[PDB]
Amino acid sequence: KDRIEIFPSRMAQTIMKARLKGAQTGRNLLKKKSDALTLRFRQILSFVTLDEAIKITNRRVNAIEHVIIPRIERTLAYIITELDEREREEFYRLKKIQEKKKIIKEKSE
Amino acid sequence: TFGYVHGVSGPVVTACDMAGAAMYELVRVGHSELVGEIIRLEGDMATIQVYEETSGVSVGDPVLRTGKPLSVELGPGIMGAIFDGIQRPLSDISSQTQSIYIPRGVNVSALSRDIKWEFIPSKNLRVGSHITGGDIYGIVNENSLIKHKIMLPPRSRGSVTYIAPPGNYDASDVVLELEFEGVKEKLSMVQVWPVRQVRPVTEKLPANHPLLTGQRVLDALFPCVQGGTTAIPGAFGCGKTVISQSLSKYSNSDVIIYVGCGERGNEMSEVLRDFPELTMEVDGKVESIMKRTALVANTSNMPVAAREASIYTGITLSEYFRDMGYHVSMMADSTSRWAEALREISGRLAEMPADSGYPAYLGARLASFYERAGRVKCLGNPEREGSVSIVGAVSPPGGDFSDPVTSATLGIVQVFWGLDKKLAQRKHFPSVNWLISYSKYMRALDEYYDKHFTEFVPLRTKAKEILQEEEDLAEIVQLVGKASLAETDKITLEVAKLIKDDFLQQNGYTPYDRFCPFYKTVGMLSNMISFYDMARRAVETTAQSDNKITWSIIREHMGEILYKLSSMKFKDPVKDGEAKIKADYAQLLEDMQNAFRSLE
Amino acid sequence: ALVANTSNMPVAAREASIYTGITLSEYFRDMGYHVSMMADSTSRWAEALREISGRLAEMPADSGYPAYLGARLASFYERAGRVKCLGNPEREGSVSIVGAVSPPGGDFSDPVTSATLGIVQVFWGLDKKLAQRKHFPSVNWLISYSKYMRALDEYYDKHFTEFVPLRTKAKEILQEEEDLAEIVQLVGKASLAETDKITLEVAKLIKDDFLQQNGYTPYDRFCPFYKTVGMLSNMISFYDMARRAVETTAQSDNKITWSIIREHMGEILYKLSSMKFKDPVKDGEAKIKADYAQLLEDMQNAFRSLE
Amino acid sequence: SAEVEQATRRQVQGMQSSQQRNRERVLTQLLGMVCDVRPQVHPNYRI
Amino acid sequence: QQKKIQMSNLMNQARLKVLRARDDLITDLLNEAKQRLSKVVKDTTRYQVLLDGLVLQGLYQLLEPRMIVRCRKQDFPLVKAAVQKAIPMYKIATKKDVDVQIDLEAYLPEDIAGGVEIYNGDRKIKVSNTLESRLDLIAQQMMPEVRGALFGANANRKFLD
Amino acid sequence: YLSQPRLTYKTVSGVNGPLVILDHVKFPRYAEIVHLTLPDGTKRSGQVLEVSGSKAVVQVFEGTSGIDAKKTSCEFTGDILRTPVSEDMLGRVFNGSGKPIDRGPVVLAEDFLDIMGQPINPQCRIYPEEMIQTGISAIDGMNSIARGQKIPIFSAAGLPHNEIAAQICRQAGLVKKENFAIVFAAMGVNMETARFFKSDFEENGSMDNVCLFLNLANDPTIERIITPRLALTTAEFLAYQCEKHVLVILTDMSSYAEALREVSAAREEVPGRRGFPGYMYTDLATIYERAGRVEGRNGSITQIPILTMPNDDITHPIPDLTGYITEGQIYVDRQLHNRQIYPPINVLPSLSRLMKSAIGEGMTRKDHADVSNQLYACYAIGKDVQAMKAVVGEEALTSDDLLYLEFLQKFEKNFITQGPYENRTVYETLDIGWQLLRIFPKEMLKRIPQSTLSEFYPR
């Protein structure tokens, strides 16, 4: 729906970044297919089969741009945010550990 | 006034026998007098954050306590000097040592004490008179451009007991003495003000006077006002040099301050090398820009305290002249590098991080930074006024706008001069994005524009509508090729191009286009918009049947008019005076109205 | 001589196991023997370090590991190499180390994977997708590397002279296939050059009949190097001859295509796909080399009659 | 290879000749400096 | 091709050969200096002056409530005088009463040119105040001037900052 | 000089991992160097990291195993780590600690410098001008290195980043339209690569102008931190005091960053972003910015830091914090390597912001800027046409597209592909560029002014 629903991880970052690059490359390659079909279509204007191919290719390209990538980008941004949140709680615990150690040392003096 | 070093854990030095110390006070640690600040205090011990390297500091070393917190020295000699982020003259350190390095523990006074300044009293004050904070009791003649007005330091007042006679005094002498409740204060020409404290004003006023930069774009469409705050993206290919030079060279401000925060060595060299070579005509004479400029230089390898403090050092210098009644324009070369320095210190202090690793108070620090800008009514009986503008740049890693520093900045600044790199690749300068850029002072300046120019406001409204429509038509043109397209849309497309080509685009390397006076900017736009309206009417009133006017017909019919419109940018203000330029523009208006008339 | 230490053993012995193993390895190294040391896992060693680092209440680094994890791995990994031994006899031995990084995933941000990659000269990464497809041995062939190429070039040029140039072409074909595969999945082979069709089909020949082997069979329990290079030599020789035929007759009347080649000399592809089965030791070295020579002669004549 | 060894010998002979010119004077300065003790209390002593 | 590589190895090794020869010259000078200091300690009054200074510097650096001076046995008569004088001078300079004893049971190896070692009360802090150690300390710290004096200044060095 | 007898302590409060905690130490300094003597006669080095009253805490450079709290003695030098520098050390090979490992003598110093040094006063910094040619066409005719800039090479693990660095050392020099030296420091290098650098530099005659520092993967991790400080300390001496131009190559800064994180842990500091110290930014700037030109002197320092990208992610703090404070990037790819192209440098993502000043009349050749701009556009277009070819086929391409496809194939084969032992000067690189550009008729070379075409295009 809004996200691919992959649990936040560094593994998820790598997969999502590779998935995003793939989607962007496919968008550009399909756009080039559409442009080639459009030029031939306009030059002719075995005609109706080009009109169907253009509408089908453009619909797929539009979905990548309006559905699939936005969804990948939201997922990636979610992953990054949640990973920084995990870093913080680790920071908190480590800081308190360092302070508790100093407190123990003061007691020993 | 001395304490002792108890121990060193790295850049943090623990002092003992230092009971008499205040938080964020200053210390000079060790025999090299290392600069640092006191942060945590406990008993008679203090925790000192040292800005410079602590290698060699011993247990038992002396620490000299300095009563004032991080402060800027304000007085004659401030102009023309290049300072470190903590107010250390770099041009004196390199010249008094013959070295290429900034000495560790270097201790050079911010303002030299060997200069005999020409000081003239106000000639209105007498012994026994009453003086209050912000009052001016004499002026130092520095150079031909900026008079350095000597103000009574804020939070000081009393009866005048001594006034120095006219003469040559250095910054170590006593110029004025005043007595408050029996306590006599001896004042020199230099005052000290904590850099994190805001200098008081009588009142904070609305900003209504435009900032008259020399560019047609970033003025006509996206106005800035004296005392206002804007942001400028800082990317290699954005062409930020144009704004920096145009703002410092031809602005209607009095004093320019350029603040580096923590840039690449070679980038700081470019700024330090370029600025001294810039000049502007003033009273008919060509003067160096450095006679009315001050610059703070910080590279990425400077002490983090200086890189973080640089931004506040700059604005403190800005307010200092603000209190003189001058209009001051400060540019922060990169506030993102400042935020990086700020995050580094938060990390060094083991503070809990917040959004994207930045301190929880990032927003509070930026908000209080920009709030210090604005037009004010100054302190002191002279009832003078002045302003500080901020044109600080942002350069987030990756160029994204999600970084808390750029997001927070955009929620604070009222004007955004969004620049682009695509425009630079197309050789279109200044590289202004147009669709992203905005200005929120359009209403604030409505009173000025109505009073002095009248037609500017409807022109800029139509101009943005025409440019936006060109963008809106982009999809139609791509899918049509301007065939199944309205003739009225062809007018929009081609006229919008005319605007982009011969108005919003400006060539600063040409002697005639170095500076476009406002009256010329509105002249150029007025004729282009007047043409637009005439072309729309020519088509619309004849588009019914039988005999209609088309864009191709207009181009063929009055091609000389389209040429004259493009030629308007070549009216050199240096040779063709205000009356001549308006006269020629009036002739174009007549030529146009008659050209369309022949079509009906 | 093995060293046995299971996951239920004390963490201190789990850490020391690696040190004990390498100590024995160096001992025999100093005898002039060539020693080959196999680790089961260095992630288990790193795990022992993380557990002890916690117990000692010392400040951790990334993902809970000690900041000095890299220093311990360098200490282990750098205790290896061909050496001149101490002692009057002037003997020279070696220790090889084969590490083993158990992958929590394919993300090499893993502190153990990352520290290892900065140290080891050869990394044989195992692809998850090839494992899922039961293609064995599972090697990515794109993310792996070996930094001993120039060191072995003298050996290869001294004894074989053919391996280095075959190796170069083999790598070019596998990488070209990955790039062509990316578009074919999109356009369905609607438009391919005749050379591109050959690359895809020869690359499949390579992936299925050269880079894939059943290590539990008499024929592929161990493939001797002379045979490994033999197999590759013929498959690339086919590539060059098939590429020449279609490019030489291109833009002419009797255009040759891959489909024409497969129909003309289909039995050549059958023989090439069968080369893994010559079964060394059961069959002789001299015959296997002669048999591969016969495949090359048959291919060469097949293209001569096709052209 | 002979020209390289020939130049090396010449460079060593040059160094030997140069250091001889003031060998005793350089040693004299070192002997004088070490013989002069100049006792001093650490600068941070505070009593 | 191989000739160029061979020449590279010959030139690089020739450079090391002359550098090693220069380092032997420095080593030989230091060894000669040690022999000349040996000649100095063969004196009596001049050596006693060295001991007076060396003992004072040791005491001032250690700053402990109790100190033990260890020396070569044959030098005890001279050290005894040096400590007797160092004590009232130390007390005036530091305003601290320090009990300074001389070790009569343990002595420095007889092969040391001269000098003393100073130990604190528990023998856990020692001052390396022997004559040979001081010479090495000074010779190294002053070495940049030794290089120039013997072999000439660096003709390519224009700025000393 | 100090001329103060050294104090040796046997008072040890305890030992905890890499740290030894001493007691009763007189007026200890921070960053003071001390020497340990263990009961077995073994000597070890260390440096004081904390001094809390009389409790000095020293980090031992080597391992702390074998150290007790009863007999081990600690001698204090009374000073900090200062490196002996001279001109003669050029042509020598040192380890991370500054000791010779080439069987030569110890350096006979001309001076001693604090390896931390001082920042260069920006008021006297001179904007970069002339070019230092590398001999590698992919980075001379496309993204040249100005004489004073700092441009990093980002590489993934497994790519030949060390072979390129070695090639630069053998081939790099001045344009030559005796005063050029290279200081090369490898941090965390394994034994096999350390041999590679040492033997490759000696055999090819380059050593006379190279000062080589090797810090091995199994060497003390603290020594890895000073190694780049010694390299720059030497560079500053050679460049600014001896009036010559120094190229400084810092290899595997990622290994430095890892060693730095270990030092932070030794201080019990709470890790920052992705485990790295919060001061990693200023620490990298401290090293990187000790370079450039200075007013009034004819010397200069340039840098080519080389960084391995963890998980091949340019976002990682190491390449991100580096690039954020450097001027452009070279950027070594993987696809070019798998295609067996050497050097594997991808010109489309690379950038040298100072190239505008590096090249031009009086520095290289009049047409330098024009050839670079046209080649970049032609390569980018050729890649675009190649992508189209994969969709529409060869027969669907027009003549202009075929010219861009031919350019792409011959550009990579002739211009980018070089080999490790072919030294291409800037003028031959430009001439090779023109050989590629003359594929196109004049009318398609839109980015080259007509005046340039008329002079250079024919023949």
Swiss-Prot record, chain E:
Tissue: Expressed in brain (at protein level).
GO-annotated biological processes: proton transmembrane transport; synaptic vesicle lumen acidification
Entry's localization field: Apical cell membrane; Cytoplasmic vesicle, Secretory vesicle, Synaptic vesicle membrane; Cytoplasmic vesicle, Clathrin-coated vesicle membrane
Top-level lineage group: Eukaryota
Keywords for the protein's UniProt record, in alphabetical order: Acetylation, Cell membrane, Cytoplasmic vesicle, Hydrogen ion transport, Ion transport, Membrane, Phosphoprotein, Synapse, Transport
Membrane topology, as annotated: Peripheral membrane protein
GO CC terms: apical plasma membrane; clathrin-coated vesicle membrane; cytoplasm; cytosol; endosome; extrinsic component of synaptic vesicle membrane; microvillus; vacuolar proton-transporting V-type ATPase, V1 domain
MF annotations from Gene Ontology: ATPase binding; proton-transporting ATPase activity, rotational mechanism
Function: Subunit of the V1 complex of vacuolar(H+)-ATPase (V-ATPase), a multisubunit enzyme composed of a peripheral complex (V1) that hydrolyzes ATP and a membrane integral complex (V0) that translocates protons. V-ATPase is responsible for acidifying and maintaining the pH of intracellular compartments and in some cell types, is targeted to the plasma membrane, where it is responsible for acidifying the extracellular environment.
Family: Belongs to the V-ATPase E subunit family.
Quaternary organization: V-ATPase is a heteromultimeric enzyme made up of two complexes: the ATP-hydrolytic V1 complex and the proton translocation V0 complex. The V1 complex consists of three catalytic AB heterodimers that form a heterohexamer, three peripheral stalks each consisting of EG heterodimers, one central rotor including subunits D and F, and the regulatory subunits C and H. The proton translocation complex V0 consists of the proton transport subunit a, a ring of proteolipid subunits c9c'', rotary subunit d, subunits e and f, and the accessory subunits ATP6AP1/Ac45 and ATP6AP2/PRR.
Protein name, per record: V-type proton ATPase subunit E 1
Organism: Rattus norvegicus
From Swiss-Prot, chain F:
Pfam families: ATP-synt_ab, ATP-synt_ab_N, ATP-synt_VA_C
Keywords assigned: ATP-binding, Cell membrane, Cytoplasm, Cytoplasmic vesicle, Hydrogen ion transport, Ion transport, Membrane, Nucleotide-binding, Synapse, Transport
Organs and tissues of expression: Expressed in brain (at protein level).
Any one GO molecular-function label of the UniProt entry: proton-transporting ATPase activity, rotational mechanism
Domain of life: Eukaryota
Membrane topology: Peripheral membrane protein
Protein name, per record: V-type proton ATPase subunit B, brain isoform
Protein purpose: Non-catalytic subunit of the V1 complex of vacuolar(H+)-ATPase (V-ATPase), a multisubunit enzyme composed of a peripheral complex (V1) that hydrolyzes ATP and a membrane integral complex (V0) that translocates protons. V-ATPase is responsible for acidifying and maintaining the pH of intracellular compartments and in some cell types, is targeted to the plasma membrane, where it is responsible for acidifying the extracellular environment.
GO biological process: ATP metabolic process; regulation of cellular pH; synaptic vesicle lumen acidification; vacuolar acidification
SUBUNIT field: V-ATPase is a heteromultimeric enzyme made up of two complexes: the ATP-hydrolytic V1 complex and the proton translocation V0 complex. The V1 complex consists of three catalytic AB heterodimers that form a heterohexamer, three peripheral stalks each consisting of EG heterodimers, one central rotor including subunits D and F, and the regulatory subunits C and H. The proton translocation complex V0 consists of the proton transport subunit a, a ring of proteolipid subunits c9c'', rotary subunit d, subunits e and f, and the accessory subunits ATP6AP1/Ac45 and ATP6AP2/PRR.
Signal peptide: none
Binding site for ATP: R353
Annotated Gene3D superfamilies: 3.40.50.12240
Gene Ontology cellular-component annotations: apical plasma membrane; clathrin-coated vesicle membrane; cytoplasm; cytosol; extrinsic component of synaptic vesicle membrane; melanosome; microvillus; plasma membrane
Subcellular localization: Apical cell membrane; Melanosome; Cytoplasm; Cytoplasmic vesicle, Secretory vesicle, Synaptic vesicle membrane
Entry similarity comment: Belongs to the ATPase alpha/beta chains family.
Lipid metabolism in keyword set: no
